[PDB]
Design a protein around this ligand. Structure first.
Ligand SMILES: O=C(CO)CO
Ligand SMILES: O=C(CO)CO
Lengths: 331, 331
């Protein structure tokens, strides 16, 4: 079995741990969990039936029974935790966005590469059967010659502290726009944009509120998206060519419905766990099973979200937030 | 009764004439129709039961029984027909877009104004009960403080000669984007944009193929739209604020469904005519009844689509097509 170590005991680590404990026991085992104090770690290990608890991430990195670390910390704490785990020879699945700016991602990627260790950014949406089916539709040429595509992700998250906080690098782009940028990149074959235009406005807590981006892609196609932590949007994503449109229905970030030229297709989520902190949390199973398949094949990154594309997504996101003057200490 | 004169006998004039002939006989009468030859005009007058036919527009302008002229010519022929009718003291309802560039619209508007004559651009969408209901939702503040809105209009019209022809000023912007620009202007109170960014690509017939625009509006709100004559899009339009979203469902340009914060509302079209050349053609009744209400009140333009806003819509459209190098002889 693939032996997992859980870094951080917040809500997302809770969901991911519950998912891993629904998978075949001969394929995945949760062997250890670290928190920034032993107390929190033991409470989590007892609730989730993990056999070892640590009060520092460093102790988890050093556990020789852990093969892969899941870094579920808040956004600004991803980098140090990843770097610790890689220095200790662990594979790492890092939560999204992998880092808060382009240089953090480059640093993590250079480290993983220099040590021949697997690293993947947990962009869970890419592994949903719906998303895989859209990629086939594109490979098959069903929509004809591409023209453009548009994604949107907006909800009123003003009462979700995580989400609006400057100190945790929250705001529309890093919480929600990350899903729009990855979708547009995916439909256009992970290609670097030729040009980006941005409009948006800030939120009174120090982060961005609502942001729309236009991206020129190579071969005369382009994408746009809108994200927001105050305004509710359609929360769909689409791609259109000369023969028609494919759409991933709301919830786009976690789609189970694909519509192609008016024809609907539903992809049910796994049955458990239910009651996950986050909508459709059960769908995290797909990325978990993907990491095991990569590691069994001896791969040092995923073909579905390669490290060079994580770097490009980071470059894009950083360019967008700089265009509207939203700077971070890290940069 | 309001006495109408029909200029041009194409498909749209066919639909508008059929609509007017379903209205109360004491309110609207179709008294005359002109075509560029008598033959075509008589055939149309016989099919549509109009009592007078002319083989030139000038003869219709001069008919003292005509009170209002409906100019249904192809795009580049709007200006000369409008100018002829206004010089002859007729009110004019001119089909969309009123002119092919900003100067044509300014010229028509200056002429109407200098003569104290009603002129309105036939932006039929604005008069649908659905659109009026969205304006109320906005006036009521139901969506909270505005944030942004997005419209799209795309279909494969490559086999519709009108639509792809350079000589008739076709293409995505003048055929379909005009609906997106008017919607965004309407939700943002007809205000002039502070900035416009554009990406798009040309079509091999000499006109634009697919075009996406980002528009900054005053008060930190913005809109975007995508239009295309090759790629099928969602064909919905939406506006979102801090308390939720309103959407006009497909067909946006001709909506009968409004969704506000998840609550659906349907507005049925008039029952006749049926079998109109254009989708939901029966809805042209609303703009026809509006022109009569303006004229009965002695108004020289519509408060719903004032001439200064037609000028601004034209200015926008022209700026967008220049940004992607699509120039016309007229400019
Ligand atoms: O990823 C998500 C957290 O907001 C979806 O809301
Ligand atoms: O106005 C319209 C003509 O395309 C709608 O298709």
């Amino acid at each position: 079995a693939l032996r997992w170590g859980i870094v951080s005991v917040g809500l997302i680590s809770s969901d991911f741990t519950a998912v891993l404990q629904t998978l075949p026991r001969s394929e995945h085992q949760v062997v250890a969990v670290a928190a920034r104090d032993l107390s929190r770690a033991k409470e989590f290990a007892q609730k989730h039936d993990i056999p070892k608890a640590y009060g520092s991430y460093e102790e988890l990195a050093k556990d020789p029974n852990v093969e892969v670390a899941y870094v579920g910390t808040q956004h600004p704490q991803h980098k140090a935790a990843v770097m610790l785990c890689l220095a200790a020879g662990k594979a790492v699945l890092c939560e999204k966005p992998m880092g808060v700016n382009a240089a953090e991602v480059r640093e993590m990627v250079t480290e993983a590469r220099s040590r021949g260790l697997f690293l993947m950014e947990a962009i869970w949406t890419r592994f949903f059967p719906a998303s895989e089916a859209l990629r086939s539709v594109l490979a098959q040429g069903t929509l004809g010659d591409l023209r453009v595509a548009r994604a949107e992700f907006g909800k009123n998250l003003t009462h979700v502290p995580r989400a609006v906080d400057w100190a945790q690098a929250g705001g529309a782009l890093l919480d929600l726009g990350i899903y729009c940028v990855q979708f547009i990149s995916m439909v256009f074959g992970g290609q670097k944009p030729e040009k980006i235009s941005v409009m948006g406005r800030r939120h009174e807590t120090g982060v961005d509120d609502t942001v729309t981006v236009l991206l020129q892609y190579p071969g005369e196609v382009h994408g746009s998206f809108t994200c927001s932590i105050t305004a509710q949007l359609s929360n769909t994503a689409s791609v259109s060519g000369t023969k028609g449109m494919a759409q991933l229905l709301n919830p786009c970030w976690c789609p189970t419905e694909l519509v192609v030229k008016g024809e609907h297709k539903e992809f049910l989520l796994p049955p458990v766990p239910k009651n996950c902190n986050f909508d459709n949390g059960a769908g995290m199973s797909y990325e978990a099973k993907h990491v095991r398949e990569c590691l069994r094949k001896g791969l040092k990154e995923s073909p579905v979200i390669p490290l060079v594309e994580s770097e490009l997504l980071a470059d894009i996101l950083e360019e967008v937030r700089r265009a509207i003057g939203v700077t971070f200490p890290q940069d």
